[PDB]
Scaffold this active site. Structure first.
Site, PDB file in Angstrom:
ATOM      1  N   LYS A   1       1.718  -8.171  -4.907  1.00 26.80           N
ATOM      2  CA  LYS A   1       1.839  -7.578  -6.228  1.00 26.80           C
ATOM      3  C   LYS A   1       2.602  -6.267  -6.184  1.00 26.80           C
ATOM      4  CE  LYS A   1      -1.844  -5.558  -8.155  1.00 26.80           C
ATOM      5  NZ  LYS A   1      -1.602  -4.099  -7.988  1.00 26.80           N
TER       6      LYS A   1
ATOM      7  N   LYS B   1       0.805  -1.213   0.000  1.00 22.93           N
ATOM      8  CA  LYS B   1       0.000   0.000   0.000  1.00 22.93           C
ATOM      9  C   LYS B   1       0.846   1.275   0.000  1.00 22.93           C
ATOM     10  CE  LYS B   1      -2.092  -1.628   3.638  1.00 22.93           C
ATOM     11  NZ  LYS B   1      -3.029  -1.739   4.795  1.00 22.93           N
TER      12      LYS B   1
END
Lengths: 106, 439, 413, 413, 439, 106
Positions: free
Chosen positions: E181, E155
């Site tokens: 990811k 994030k």
């Protein structure tokens, strides 16, 4: 003419004699006094291949003292006695990382 | 023409500025000399035959916008000269050094020119690759953050077979030191070939870095005859899983430093670079190019780990002149600090830093001079200025790390290194029995 | 002091170097000489134990003379012998990393200049040498018995590649042989190198069909990288270009040796400009004299080493400016200190390069560059703006007719 | 709310973006703006602990303005500054992955259009830019002082490659410069690309010998793969083709940047069609305006960006259709919101591309595309079926004579 | 011409059908608008000059065969348009998207066109490679069959060095999550280069997948400037023995997705693909292209693991519209389901499926919504919608897997996930002490 | 702020507490109730490299119950006590494979 003993020593600040708890206060205090907020990591084997050691908790940030860091390292090593613990310094203002030093070796 | 001295010209943020330490002939004024450095750099003043009406006048010409004399000195000054961005190919320094120092210093009515400093804009830094790694990628690549890195220049550089060389690699690695280097003649030679040197060095690392538990390396001198011999000399260091290699960026030039910098990012190898042939250029205080240009002409051409020099024998005046390009080597923004010698505010646009390699004598007591001045962000070579170590290379390697890792540890206790720097090494020479004999 | 051995005679397998050394009063000449030979080959810091580990009696650079410069105090010439087994076969980036690498930053020397260097026949033959010597590249141009004619097509900067190829063309039909590129035309955003090679190639192949002789243009390949240098090289060979220009001190000698091994392998003659040369020579107390770099280039390869004009020189410096001309061009030189050639050096029958100087400000100063520079010379006309009659092309005729009338005056007497 | 900082001034190392944002009544403009800058750079979901881990004060896109569109409620223009250190040097597929990547699917915004974007001189120079700018590719065609002449050879579909090369030919001998391919001729089973390149090459080399000028054809290379794109590219270079056509939004900007770095390395000028453009522009409330994609193409490379015809536009939209023409073609633009250029953007002396629009339905509407589009334009004649007199070739003469009479009327006054 | 509206035309099984959500200008009827979408897609209606007698009339033209209005809506309809097979090159979508959406939506007498759905025949699907692996090859490649796969989008995407990024890789991997990811800006950048990101990510996987005993991976973002930079960015991920990489198929396009799909089958690497720049195109309900085309224009161009989106905040109407393309993502045959939005019966000819990646908030309680709707055949990203985890990334990774592997386990006891889905997580928050703090 | 213990856990359905025999009935029952016919596998070491585990018997197919599967797993683990046994689900209608879960670990 003393020889050099075969010792697999460790990465930084490790050719010294093992760190007394007064000095472990002072090292993380300078990690505090740069306007920086320290962190703790641990692992089992110190390999040159293994660059990562497992984090203990979230990195500590807030208005705290050096004794609130050693509550994780010194007072709470009882669930990993036979592991290699160190203090990590994640210098995020410069995207850097400061003062790995291995603490409480088995 | 005296159309190259526009003193009202505010420099654009996308211009390329240059600070020429101009010393003209005594029959030449300061304004005609400074207009002549700016002219023949880009558009010469030989004749004016029917081309003052032609293609581009206010474009494409280096213009001098400032003249200031040097304090305490006469018959010389510092000319600030603005070059537009569109003169150069984007991404080279072999076109920086053909306008700015090419055909400039050989003007007949100038006694001595020195390119002191140079302002590369953000508009021209961003095309460059920069160094293949950072000052921070290779603390992360090598897991050695918290203290400056080390070295052992192997002092019998000439006359070692590659295995016997690879023992002088090994015991400087088996002890404390991290980055033992090839010297400037440790190359291909009849007494050791580089094919055989790289083999026996790679076995010296593999044994040392697996019994001391760190990621140790060797500066492999890949300086070669050709660029194709160099990459073949570099790709063989890749096949040995070597962290760092060595280039010589002024002998081999600023093409075959950029290719190797394009090589070293592409193939994950770190690029130490020695400053061979630098004191042809840096040494004279009135003529040449100052090293601060060539330390900023390496951060763009590419490479970690530049030698910066002994701060040992320097006074407090030339300490900041070293610290002028070292802050132009490791930091992202500097100001206009002429006490440190920096003549232009340099914005590096977060292009990565270059480690500040420093030959620091052999002198163990000269460690806290090299830790307060050069922080964790530096490398400390330990060859030259060497009486030797009377117990060997390997306990002379721990005596150059316990000397470091107590000096770095004393920086972290709230102590200082100028009032009690010597009071840490003999404080640490009690525990480690190998420090007290080095002295 | 083991590195000043004045009874040592220089072997013919030694790589001799002549350093003009200037210390402080307080450092004697014998210590100053034996320190130039020290930190260029093997440092004198270690004297106690590691001095007698290995062969430091045969792998060390040693002095064999100290000769003071006449008239100038504190300024001598230290002849230093370097053994052959120290260097790499075929690289100057090991020669200029030993001999001038870490020695000029010695603290107790306040100026230091490598004047002359001797490469023996034992070490010259390791090099390829130049791509094509003079009597090897007078043959490709079909141009005999007269010095060649360079030109400076410098409408200073800011030309489109057609506009560049308009002005490069009409000096070639004017009679000039080559029309040398700017150093600043390496893919600048107003004309890129892909375009500045094409419309030049459209000019040259339309220039050799108008006059008849084989003409060309010194196309610059001084790139960011050796990969992009051998993209600029190989596209000139695609366009059948006779000669390529390459700056050699900015790009380095690894860029020469990559390209001069390219240039013999593809028949291109490799013109050379002296970028960054005045950083290194031009100080009579410190640096490296140009004759070393005009000889380090004959071993790294590259024809047409740029030389100084004879016109702006004194009578004592015309020997020096003919000193490094006789070095690169003639196959044997003799020790003449009055012209700065400090060593008798056989050239191992290198294909020695052509000696090019600029000029061209005046048309009446042509036989001064023809009675002094022989048939083995390119005369760059400084003709950046234009010639004097009507522009370039009636001046380029006036630049060639002012030489064929003088080469006619050569063979008369 | 830390991402709407209206006191922030845009640095000249910031990549500014102008978003025309339309939320619901119920979302204020300050929250709607500071959410466009949020999920395009750094999301606002994490606020408690991980907001102050690292440098989220300098690596974050921030708003510095909110300007409402005049006359239209719930519709403002949020100028957002993105720092330079977020993006990749030389890729728009990181620009259009940050700035329009995950931001248009924000739930509380009911329409959103990136109107204009500013790439600074700091970020333009990382790009190669186009293969050849106008005054760089007027030179290869030997065509000066007049706008170029495109053509649509569209016997709609279903031609053999000879039948295609019969109709592509006789507009080139008619006087037209280029005869643009279909978008559906990418190796369709009636004519493959290997054949549609060959008989076109047999037409062009037999067309430049009949007229005399250098002519070509925008050959389509919009392939399944970049490998098969650089098989279609390299076979046009084998046939010595001047210009290649490439669709750029279907194939992507990685297909441009693979090919525009190919096209400068092989001298092909890279014509571009705007396939899939009306998916993205053409909605005045949502999408990305074409001027971003006409500027994302000048950085990805490719000449001849297709522009809108001036004929079917209102007087207020002729500024907009001249807005993205002055962006790609001129080397400096100024902030003119009446023509939709929301940023003063210096172009770092990019070799700026030519602006091509279609037309060609009428021969009498030629100077409307010549008094408005200058000499730096290709005029695609919509001439798919035929021209008006006798077919294509007496109409292609009538298409060129109807411009040289008007370019004559340009220089008169 | 109105020769492009043949309403009697039965579509051939080898035609290529398209469902255009046509909204014309208010002065344009439905039959002339639909004949204009079918015309200029393939063969435009500019002039009729002497070519109505020429080459091919009934061949090679897109023809509209159906018009139906949208229920509850006016001034708009859905035109079904049949394209013959021989218009296109076999094996590309860059020729699908130049007839069907190229030069179509910019017709002047149409207010808004949207390509809703598209019927690729078996005669055209079989030329395509399909995805480089299946929905079933990569359960087999990764030995993780029985439950949907997981993710941790890191994030703080902007402002992490590659090793510090590789810790946020590592602890989301050290816990429960499988496929952390790169985000859409986690690419080459001055703060972390991809050469250095891939290194420090590959060490994060190697340590995590050897102390937790699974085949864990990372979505390596290989989106690049060029196709040659991308394959060089992809082949370096091959050299690290990486299972999965990441492409961005709408920014980079449908050539450099196919090459990487031709790369990923040839070199055994899985191809996750993020839907960057998708809401430029999918968002407006009257104009653009629906994602169901671009989810079927990826299953042919090639790639596993497409993001499908939050089904969290969606109503029961747009849940099936998501489930329209998700059944067109994972299954082999669908029917004509307009309640799910599917406008054509799509026969996939046993070309392999694509996993249905779903960003699902951070919300642990929103797991059984994402397991009943998306089965074992999906991937669950856990970034966006994130309050954070107050114990860290690594116990926040087990709290996103024990939340999963009890919800998957409760599907296998005969329980359901809509009546007692929340009654499993707090049932499992008793045993695992890390679930009850995430909440 | 409890740390995550160093546990080399297993592939699917393994972060749960170890499965009681009532739950092992129910898991294979849903493997039964899809119209599917289950199977049993075993191995010694659970590596990420080792994708294959050794089959116990032929896969069970016929009209049987969940207790006829546990006769192989539960009642007949006596010849491999120190091995890793799991239940495999070989979904052949879709060429798929369903619900690996490791049972009776040493």
């Amino acid at each position: 003419m003393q020889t050099l003993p075969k010792e697999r020593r460790y990465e930084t600040l490790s050719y010294l004699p093992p760190l007394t708890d007064v000095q472990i206060e002072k090292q993380v205090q300078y990690i505090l006094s740069q306007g920086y907020i320290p962190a703790v990591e641990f692992n089992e084997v110190s390999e040159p291949t293994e660059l990562y050691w497992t984090l203990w908790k979230l990195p500590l940030f807030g208005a705290k003292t050096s004794r609130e860091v050693l509550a994780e390292v010194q007072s709470c090593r009882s669930q990993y006695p036979g592991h290699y613990i160190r203090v990590v310094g994640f210098d995020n203002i410069k995207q850097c990382q400061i003062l790995s030093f291995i603490v409480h070796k088995p | 023409r005296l159309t190259y001295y526009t003193p009202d010209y505010t420099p654009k943020d996308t211009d390329i500025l240059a600070a020429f330490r101009v010393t003209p002939q005594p029959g030449v004024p300061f304004e005609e000399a400074a207009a002549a450095v700016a002219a023949e750099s880009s558009t010469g003043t030989w004749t004016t035959v029917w081309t003052d009406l032609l293609t581009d006048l206010d474009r494409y010409k280096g213009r001098c916008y400032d003249i200031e004399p040097v304090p305490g000195e006469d018959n010389q000054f510092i000319a600030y000269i603005a070059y537009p961005l569109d003169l150069f190919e984007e991404g080279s320094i072999t076109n920086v050094l053909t306008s700015i120092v090419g055909n400039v210093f050989g003007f007949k009515a100038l006694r001595a020119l020195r390119l002191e400093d140079i302002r590369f804009p953000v508009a021209y830094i961003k095309t460059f690759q920069g160094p293949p790694h950072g000052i921070q990628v290779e603390r992360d690549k090598l897991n050695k953050y918290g203290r400056p890195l080390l070295g052992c220049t192997i002092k019998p550089k000439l006359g070692l077979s590659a295995k016997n060389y690879g023992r002088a690699v090994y015991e400087c690695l088996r002890g404390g030191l991290d980055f033992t280097k090839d010297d400037e003649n440790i190359n291909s030679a009849p007494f050791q070939r580089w094919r055989d040197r790289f083999l026996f060095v790679a076995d010296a690392i593999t044994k040392a870095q697996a019994e001391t538990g760190e990621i140790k390396g060797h500066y492999l001198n890949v300086t070669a005859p050709t660029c194709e011999e160099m990459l073949k000399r570099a790709e063989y260091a890749k096949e040995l899983k070597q962290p760092i290699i060595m280039h010589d960026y002024l002998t081999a030039g600023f093409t075959a430093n950029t290719t190797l910098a394009r090589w070293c990012r592409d193939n994950g190898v770190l690029l130490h670079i020695h400053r061979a042939m630098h004191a042809v250029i840096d040494r004279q205080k009135n003529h040449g190019i100052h090293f601060r240009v060539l330390a900023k002409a390496l951060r763009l051409s590419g490479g970690d780990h530049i030698h910066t020099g002994t701060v040992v024998g320097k006074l407090e005046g030339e300490r900041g002149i070293t610290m002028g390009f070292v802050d132009l080597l490791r930091e992202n923004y500097v100001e206009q600090d002429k006490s440190r010698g920096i003549y232009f505010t340099q914005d590096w646009a977060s292009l990565p830093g270059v480690m500040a390699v420093a030959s620091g004598g052999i002198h163990v007591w000269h460690m806290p001079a090299l830790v307060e001045i050069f922080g964790d962000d530096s490398v400390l070579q330990f060859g030259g200025g060497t009486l030797g170590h009377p117990w060997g290379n390997a306990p002379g390697a721990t005596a150059n790390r316990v000397a470091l890792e107590a000096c770095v540890q004393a920086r972290n206790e709230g102590r200082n290194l100028a009032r009690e720097g010597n009071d840490v090494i003999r404080e640490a020479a009690k525990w480690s029995p190998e420090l007290a004999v080095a002295c």
